[PDB]
Amino acid sequence: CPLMVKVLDAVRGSPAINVAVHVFRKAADDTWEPFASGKTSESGELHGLTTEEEFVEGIYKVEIDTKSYWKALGISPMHEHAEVVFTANDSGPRRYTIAAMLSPYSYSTTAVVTNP
Amino acid sequence: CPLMVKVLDAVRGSPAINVAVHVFRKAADDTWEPFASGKTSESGELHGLTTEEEFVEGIYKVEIDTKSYWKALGISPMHEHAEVVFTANDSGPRRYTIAAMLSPYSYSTTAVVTNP
Amino acid sequence: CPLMVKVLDAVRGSPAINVAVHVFRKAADDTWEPFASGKTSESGELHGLTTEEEFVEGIYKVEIDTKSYWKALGISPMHEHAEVVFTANDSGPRRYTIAAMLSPYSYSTTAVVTNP
Amino acid sequence: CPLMVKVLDAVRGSPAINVAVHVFRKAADDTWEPFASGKTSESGELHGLTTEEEFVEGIYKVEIDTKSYWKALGISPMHEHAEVVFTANDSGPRRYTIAAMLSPYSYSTTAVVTNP
Ligand SMILES: [Cl-]
Ligand SMILES: [Cl-]
Ligand SMILES: [Cl-]
């Protein structure tokens, strides 16, 4: 798992389950290329997005569909989505966890990078 | 003053000074239209971005150039920027403050909406 | 004004209004001695806790009664309070702003330190 | 485990390793009873603090010795230690992860609470 995304709900104190996540990589021409996507599990985790070979140095974007999440819980949110854009592997290979904590008016995101 | 941005550096314990901020509004196009921009002052605040007459209902994106801020201090941060996408004024006009807290591997962004 | 506290509610996108804040200073017997207290205003801000004369070097604790706040809004909170413990004035007098972002299962507290 | 603590470093974007963590439970004589302690692992995680049988309803404090952690990394921090205080098991038994992200001037803490 070179790349893992974790999503948490700060209103209920729970993993955010069945949240849609899209990942893109910036391509040579400044456009965003589709790279991976999925839905978070019961633990709020999305694994199996990429291989060590496919996950090269670059700029990556993680788009989180927060609005559908809230609406499915009966909340009409102010935040439309979250977009986290980061540089990877520029110092050589690392495992990355992109975590996001959601509220209807806020998010926080953290990156944890560890060396294999 | 309908839109303000306030930015704090949580690792150095200081306002984040001279940080570039861009604001976009979603067009019927579905395209992000440039709307306003400026730099944070010595207190980490950016006022005067827009006027009541220009800040109509819609979907807005605030992008804070955190990468340039950290690089100017010598630091290679994780993220290219901090951002928030929100719906504005859709139940009458409000004052919006976007509050951002920054570290090199994490950020939070919060929309604070008042009357007053 | 050497110590200020600013409190934001990240779930409702509002200042946290009428929240009790208590400040302690560690005494020479390692007990937390009561030092100052107040309630946040309509803007989420608490000014006037202490004077330059009374705010000497030491270790201080700021405790924000987040439990009573969430309870008043009909929200079950996790924490009894949000807190920061910091060393103050240990190399010259500074102005300290404690910035707290709140949600029912998450908080952040940041010491913002600035000069004369 | 009914209780896990995870500690992260926001400056380095890494788990915070060999961080001292003490857990207390508020007693009837409203003193803090020592309850458990340990040091975070290489993943920043501290497991095995308690058992289901011992982890009764109550008010708990998680104290994190952030000062010694920063000092070992050659930083003399303004933040002295974190004290995360919460009610546990008051809606019946749950599993708790208390996560904290550290800077020399700030911290952010989240609780994830799940029902097994
Ligand atoms: Cl981002
Ligand atoms: Cl904060
Ligand atoms: Cl606490």
Residue ranges of the domains in chain B? 1-116
Which residue is closest to D44 within chain A, CA to CA?
A112
Partners of C14 in the β-ladder: C9
User: According to the 3-state scheme, what is the secondary structure of A28-93?
Assistant: CCCCEEEEEEEECCCCCEECCCCCCCCCCCEEEEEEECHHHHHHHCCCCCCEEEEEEEEEECECEC
Q: Which two tokens stand for residue B79?
A: 């993220």
Cβ contacts (< 8 Å) between C106 and chain D: which residues? 108-111
Helix-then-strand count for chain B, H and E: 1, 9
Find out whether B36 and B50 touch, Cβ atoms under 8 Å: yes
Element (H, E) at D68: helix D66-72
Q: What is the CA radius of gyration of chain D?
A: 14
Measured CA to CA, the distance from residue D79 to residue D16 in angstroms comes to 15
Q: Which residues of C touch D (CB under 8 A)?
A: 59, 61, 78-81, 83-87, 105-113
Angle at D46 (CA atoms; ends D41, D47), nearest 5 degrees: 120
Torsion D114-D69-D19-D64 (CA) sign? negative
Measured CA to CA, the distance from residue C9 to residue C40 in angstroms comes to 12
- Experimental determination approach used: X-ray
Measured CA to CA, the distance from residue C29 to residue C39 in angstroms comes to 29
Partners of C17 in the β-ladder: none
Read off the DSSP letter of residue B29: T
Find out whether B98 and B108 touch, Cβ atoms under 8 Å: no
Torsion C39-C41-C45-C49 (CA) sign? negative
Torsion B86-B90-B91-B93 (CA) sign? positive
- Three-state SS at B69: helix
Cβ contacts (< 8 Å) between A14 and chain D: which residues? 112-114
Q: Which residues of A touch C (CB under 8 A)?
A: 9-13, 78, 101, 103-106, 108
Measured CA to CA, the distance from residue D116 to residue D97 in angstroms comes to 13
Chain mean position to CA D115: 20
User: According to the 3-state scheme, what is the secondary structure of chain C?
Assistant: CCEEEEEEECCCCEECCCCEEEEEEECCCCCEEEEEEEECCCCCEECCCCCCCCCCCEEEEEEECHHHHHHHCCCCCCECCEEEEEEECECECCEEEEEEEEECCEEEEEEEEECC
